[PDB]
Design goal:
Elements (H helix, E strand, L loop, with lengths): L1 E3 L5 E3 L3 H11 L11 E6 L5 H16 L7 E6 L5 H14 L3 E6 L4 H12 L4 E5 L8 H15 L6 E2 L9 E9 L4 E9 L5 E6 L3 E2 L3 H18 L8 E7 L6 H17 L8 E9 L3 E3 L4 E3 L4 E7 L4 E13 L6 H15 L14 H18 L7 H5 L5
Parallel strand pairs: 3-4, 3-5, 5-6, 8-12, 12-13
Antiparallel strand pairs: 1-2, 1-7, 8-9, 9-10, 9-11, 13-17, 14-17, 15-16, 16-17
Helix pairs in contact: 2-5, 6-7
Bound molecules: manganese (II) ion.
The site of manganese (II) ion has 2 residues, from loops.
It binds a RNA duplex through helix 1, helix 4, strand 6 and helix 5.
PDB class: rna-binding protein/rna
Keywords: RNA-binding protein-RNA complex, RNA-binding argonaute, piwi domain, rnai, risc, protein-RNA complex
Assembly: trimeric
RNA sequence: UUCGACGC
RNA sequence: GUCGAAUU
């Protein structure tokens, strides 16, 4: 229903102009804390008007929308549009003392994006931009969205979902794997609060399909060990797994391993030894047109949650299957409503820009990682640190 | 790579 | 390549 921003304010969802005006008035839910109060802009068009306007917009929005005050932006010019010359300005910036780097790429050069991006994820919060894509017409839409994600990557919290703290899971784990070609894959596991904020993330190395279940288990254990070490008193009595991704087909073996992993985390006191949990498969299914937030039951274990398209009335359904749960027959229906509601609230959380993705954050954010992991691997960049664990570097 | 959507 | 980004 509403987004919680700063100073105790809440603004309706589904209205980006009201969210922006809200941030100008009250601030974000959390301003990032900075060490230098300095950010670098790195580019190769020193007399460019578009870059001039870009700098001045970033400067005024950072202060006025984001309430990050007195930041200095320093500029660094590179003079050849290739890896070693840009990297050299990047290095100059990092030696200067900066909280993050905004890097304007020159043209369209995919190997160069992945090479530079993998070096920076490893170093310092960064936000790329394309010189060719700038225009006066779209500059304000462009900077508005760009800063939602750069503020997050600097450790800020734009807005969180307003949810009933008595309803839903204590934590939600988005987990699964994504195949990056026909043989190789990586596992992921991400812990969320019910308010849609990411608490911790782990990704496995790239492995082969034969190694899927082995790394699925360990990646999930690492992410919970991580969450628990930085939240020792967060009791988990209600736990939900959101399983997603193009991964090997292996559903019974996979459910058995997920069940085992929760039984080991109980033994190790990472969750309650009487935790109530459900393991769910979330799958995007083919769109359709009515010629909603609606919950459809297809069988006692298969459900559909229908959502407007984030763009006849077009609908993007999300399939939801309960593959395992330890719920009582009595609790059952009630729990089904809560878990479906929660999936709907999470589908409204997106720190990539102002517009809702209408896809659950637990499904969406692992897709964003996958794109980077796949292409870094393909273009031979630097493989992707408690900093990367708590920060949404993939946005 | 601000992002999205279409068409091929 | 074709639009679009308060009001989805
Ligand atoms: Mn991004």
């Amino acid at each position: 229903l509403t987004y919680r921003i700063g100073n105790g304010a809440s603004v309706p969802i589904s209205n980006t102009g009201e969210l922006i005006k809200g941030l100008r008035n009250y601030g974000p839910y959390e301003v990032p804390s900075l060490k230098y109060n300095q950010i670098a802009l790195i580019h190769n068009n020193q007399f460019s008007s578009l870059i001039n306007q870009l700098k001045s917009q970033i400067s005024s929005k950072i202060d006025e929308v984001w309430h990050i005050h007195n930041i200095n932006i320093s500029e660094f010019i590179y003079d050849s549009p290739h890896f070693d010359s840009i990297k050299s300005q990047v290095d100059n910036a990092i030696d200067t003392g900066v909280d993050g780097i905004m890097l304007v790429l020159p043209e369209y050069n995919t190997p160069l994006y992945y090479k530079l991006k993998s070096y920076l994820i490893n170093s310092i919060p960064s936000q790329f931009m394309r010189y060719d894509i700038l225009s006066n017409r779209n500059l304000t839409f462009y900077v508005d969205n760009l800063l939602v994600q750069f503020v997050s990557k600097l450790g800020g919290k734009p807005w969180i979902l307003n949810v009933d703290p008595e309803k839903g899971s204590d934590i939600i784990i988005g987990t699964g794997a994504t195949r990056i070609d026909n043989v190789n894959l990586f596992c992921f596991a991400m812990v969320f609060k019910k308010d849609g904020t990411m608490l911790w993330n782990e990704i496995s190395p790239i492995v082969t399909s034969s190694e899927y279940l082995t790394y699925l288990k360990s990646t999930i254990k690492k992410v919970v060990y991580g969450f628990k070490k930085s939240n020792p008193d967060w009791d988990v009595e209600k736990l939900t797994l959101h399983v997603s991704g193009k991964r090997p087909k292996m559903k019974d073996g996979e459910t058995k391993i997920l069940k085992e992993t929760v039984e080991e985390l109980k033994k190790q006191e990472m969750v309650s030894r009487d935790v109530k949990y459900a393991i769910l498969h979330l799958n995007e299914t083919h769109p359709f047109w009515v010629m909603e937030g609606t919950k459809v039951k297809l069988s006692s274990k298969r459900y559909l949650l229908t959502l407007l398209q984030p763009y006849v009335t077009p609908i993007k359904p999300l399939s939801v299957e309960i593959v395992s749960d330890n719920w009582t027959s009595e609790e059952y229906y009630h729990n089904v409503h809560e878990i479906l509601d929660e999936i709907y609230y999470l589908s409204k959380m997106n720190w990539r820009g102002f517009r809702s993705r209408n896809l659950p954050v637990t499904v969406n954010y692992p897709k964003l990682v996958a794109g980077i992991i796949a292409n870094v691997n393909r273009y031979g960049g630097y493989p992707i640190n408690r900093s990367l664990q708590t920060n949404p570097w993939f946005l």
